[PDB]
Amino acid sequence: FNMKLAINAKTITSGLKYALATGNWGSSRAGVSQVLNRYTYSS
């Protein structure tokens, strides 16, 4: 038993990173994340 092997960080890390990249919460949800519009400060 060694803690580093027991806990796998990319589970959480790459999980969230993935989700926000694709914006699919599951599909059970999609398009939740969207790249910001910098067209104009109003936009």
Residues that bind another protein (CB under 8 A): 4-5, 7-10
Q: How far is the CB of 12 from another protein (least distance, A)?
A: 12
Please give the single-letter amino acid code of residue 30.
A
* 3 or 35: CB nearest another protein: 3
Q: How far is the CB of 32 from another protein (least distance, A)?
A: 26
Q: How far is the CB of 34 from another protein (least distance, A)?
A: 27
Where helices occur in 1-43 by DSSP H, the ranges are: 3-6, 9-22
Per DSSP, the three-state class of 40 is coil
Up-side HSE of residue 26: CA atoms within 13 Å toward CB? Answer: 6
